[PDB]
Amino acid sequence: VNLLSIFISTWLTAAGFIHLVENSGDPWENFQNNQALTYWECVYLLMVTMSTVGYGDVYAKTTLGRLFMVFFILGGLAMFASYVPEIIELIGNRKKYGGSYSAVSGRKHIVVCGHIT
Amino acid sequence: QRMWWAFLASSMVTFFGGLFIILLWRTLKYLWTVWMTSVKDWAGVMISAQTLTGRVLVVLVFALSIGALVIYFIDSSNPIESCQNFYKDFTLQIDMAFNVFFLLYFGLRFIAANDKLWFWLEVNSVVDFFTVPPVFVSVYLNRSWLGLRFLRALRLIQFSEILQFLNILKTSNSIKLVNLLSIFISTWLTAAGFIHLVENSGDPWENFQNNQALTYWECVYLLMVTMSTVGYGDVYAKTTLGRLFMVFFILGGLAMFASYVPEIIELIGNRKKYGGSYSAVSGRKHIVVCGHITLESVSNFLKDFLHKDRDDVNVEIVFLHNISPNLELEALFKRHFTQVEFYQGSVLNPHDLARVKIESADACLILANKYCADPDAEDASNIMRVISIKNYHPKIRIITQMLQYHNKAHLL
Amino acid sequence: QRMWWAFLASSMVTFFGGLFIILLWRTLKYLWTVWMTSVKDWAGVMISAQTLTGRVLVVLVFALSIGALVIYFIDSSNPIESCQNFYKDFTLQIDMAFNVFFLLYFGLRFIAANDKLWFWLEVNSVVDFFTVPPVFVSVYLNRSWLGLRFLRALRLIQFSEILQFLNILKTSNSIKLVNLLSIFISTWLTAAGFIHLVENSGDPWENFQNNQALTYWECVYLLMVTMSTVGYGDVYAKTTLGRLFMVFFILGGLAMFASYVPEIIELIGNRKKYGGSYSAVSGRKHIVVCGHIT
Amino acid sequence: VFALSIGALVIYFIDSSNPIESCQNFYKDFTLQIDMAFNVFFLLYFGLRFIAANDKLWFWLEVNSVVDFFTVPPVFVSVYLNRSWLGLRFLRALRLIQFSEILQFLNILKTSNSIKL
Amino acid sequence: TVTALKAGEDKSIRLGLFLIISGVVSLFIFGFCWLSPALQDLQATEANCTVLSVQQIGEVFECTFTCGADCRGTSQYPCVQVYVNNSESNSRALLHSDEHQLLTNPKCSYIPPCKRENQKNLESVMNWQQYWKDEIGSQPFTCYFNQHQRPDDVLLHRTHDEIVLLHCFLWPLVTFVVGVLIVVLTICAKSL
């Protein structure tokens, strides 16, 4: 739950940054190269990118957008490298057995205790 | 025509009644205050997976499920409207035929149910009242509608189990691999059907005008290109619903990859290095070096046995060991690549001894570790090996290293 | 001209006879009821990998195989039709020359065969009656046809073994790396040739009108960009057959990556940390601390 | 040598960003003086490395030496022509291989893991 | 010397199983992939449609011609619209040469092949137009007409040929048979 929460927070922060950077154009072309896209097309683009799918149906047109996009690729890669071997791998492997023998109506029941081999 | 809402409604309606009534029945201990066993047994005698009648009906539900997907792939490949009259995919008869059985089998599963509510909440049950009712409305309308019938592909989860009772495949690793392939195909085809269905009609917000005219085949392709992370962007979901589902399917596939590769896929990837017989070498003689295989012993044996000063001789050497050639394979291999094989089976196991075809050998040679802690123990192990070899085949020459002289008497 | 069906037919026809007759011969214990050894030995004395005559003919089959790929890359790079008369890629002579040897070597492999059926079902044998007959129809027609000749690149599987008998490379890790590189190049070039061949003529369903006019080089590039998962989508298969093969080649490459990286590639990645002499230090004195380093 | 190498890359990034032809006369990236200045030192330092060489041939075949006679002479022809040409001067970025070692003698970073990173 | 060890097998029943599996999957793929062109072919029935009138609309449409050396030139041709009458349906419909011509341009009932000279294209139109004015009204001939999707369209030529549909379908069927014989003939050899 901690990892999911931090992943959602960084995804939504970086999507908001790209939206804000694309709402007004680059300074250099007097804000004429502006992309008229929603926050939803923006947060989608970043999922398609950080998962490395990269359809190129939408991409940042602005030079500021690109500069941030290369930074967000590198930050996501760094987080993936610094989180998967440490915490995500441990979370992936869990208990194989737990809980009761339940959901078997009417029958008798015995437990083989002791040395199972 | 707008009546397509009634098809999905008829599914949801049957689900609704199912979740309300089956739980309402198990309330209030006092019934009121102020034949069932026979039919249940008759339904459940056939449902047993070990019984012949149950294994063969389970092949049936699976075969009919694939047949329902084949015809789904036929109609899903058509335009959104066609003149359905003289040739509507072999008519209402094949439309009803599979679900006339699945409705009977859903009824059979419900009267066969042994824990009422749990039977309904089994994931294997949930899909049935999703796929069955929409077609029962299609036949009442006498007009085909592309429904959620692709969810029937989720019966492919059972393919590993039928391969186990039909006894086609036997290795546990093979059964796990077939299980994994089957679940991967089922989820890929389910998620591809969802995206196809979501893109067939446009988003609600633009009054369905932003609809992408793509086939189920372009759709299932897109999802392979995406889940493999290739992502060519030659095709992608245009709709906002399509995108929302696409981000979910990326996250579900990533979750499955993270939760499956380290656990099962890694184990399947590493298998036995050696197995099967020494076979496919015509005419030659054959011997097995039994006993203690270690690097020095085989290096000095092979260098004399195959020194190229014998002239009129063959190669032979089959080899057999129980703790594998972990280091032997890098430290020396078998001083030949095409010839001289290695069996990972033990000398004592009759099945492994049959694997080497010991009966067809000219001799077994038993090597001993001179470096043993207890010479008596090593000698008695080699005598045990001699005894097993002689028991399997009395008529074979055996040659054997003994570490102590007094132990030679036990061979006599 | 429509006779291009006969080229692939001539391959399949020779395969057909091969699988039927070689198995039919080993049936019925009673032959009827109610020189072979000498020629086999003469054929197999040369086929030995340890013998000098066998190692040098195996270099030959490999060198001629690469030569057949070089000329394949030449013609596969041309338009779909050209005036083939005054200069048809050094004429019917070089067209026959390599397969005049490979047909003799296929005959040699069959008379050298020691377990009849198994010799035919060796993957190293299967490719020969695919690449050889189509050219024998090309010379009868005196008109070149782009066939399945790229499958000859599958002889590159042997490159590790010849590097071992020619004694150029000696480390086992080096031999495994050269083996892996060779098999990766062979499968990449085979799958690129399949996609090129599938895209040269259009899909059947649109009467071959949806054909993509791309070279073998754009095709082998596309497959590298795809199997590395980069996937620029500047080029992609347009045909439905091309897509069906492309999804299969994605799945085969993924399967090979899953079945090779944890087993062999990981072992090759980790090697010795130290080796060789203390050399390249002029003039100085030298001492070795022997014994217990801690 | 490291600071001058970065300076040669900074000016490389300046001119490489121009059109393929420009009127190079009144303001050619601070003139032939800065064009010669870095390689007047690197040519002296290549000469110094050759007279400092202790195993003649090996000094020449060190990868650190090979890059010098690739980056130095093209500029010596540029000054003879008095006209800038985009050459292989980006290979000078290969001096960045030494950055770990200078961080070790200047004593800024001390952990072995940090030096490897 | 050797025993039944001489049989071996491995690369025979295995190949036979791969051959039957390749055969069944290939025809199964072609089945899902040929229904559409087969549907379109069956959707058009046989009638004796008659030419009702040819008029010259006078429109000009652009066509693309190629010289083989990746020529991208475009030329112009006059538009010819011909209206036919069905035999059993007596309904006025638009003539077209073929499916290709229809989908590239449905306004003109013929597209002559694209010519580098506009004068030659016009002459071919007048030539084809003369070869179509002679047979008007009478002499009904074999005609293809659709009355499901395109009731106002009439084709002179068929969209598809059964020959390629059959030629690609026979191969996986015989490939399955070749797999089955290799399986059972291996089992026949395995006995003795």
Ligand SMILES: CC(C)CCC[C@@H](C)[C@H]1CC[C@H]2[C@@H]3CC=C4C[C@@H](O)CC[C@]4(C)[C@H]3CC[C@]12C
């Ligand atoms: C089981 C499978 C893999 C067997 C292989 C079948 C192959 C060889 C068959 C199946 C369909 C066939 C094609 C179908 C249609 C045509 C058009 C015809 O006018 C000439 C041959 C041609 C171009 C065929 C060539 C061979 C072909 C591709």
Ligand SMILES: [K+]
């Ligand atoms: K991509």
